[PDB]
Amino acid sequence: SKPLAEQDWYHGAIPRIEAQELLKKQGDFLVRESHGKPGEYVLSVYSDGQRRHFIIQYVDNMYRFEGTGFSNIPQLIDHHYTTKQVITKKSGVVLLNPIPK
């Protein structure tokens, strides 16, 4: 229930092109507010030599990727960061390095 603005890895409204400069090594990640899909949040990660951008789905009052839903984004991100569960089956992405704001 801790706020996004107090998380080291939350970068607010930085655009995709700026996230590119910040994501450089396997498992680097940050969260930002989408421009292409206004009102949505994005988990941006560096994995296998590429930047990958996942919409954090918000459905029925829950934030999720492909599995468990949580009431808030910090709980979802912390879950993946501590358990190393992949973001999606297709991507196999594992969060390793929170990129500080």
């Binding site: 292409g36 899909k37 991507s91």
Partner: peptide, 6 residues
Amino acid sequence: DEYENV
């Protein structure tokens, strides 16, 4: 721009 899951 492309998003992985949307």
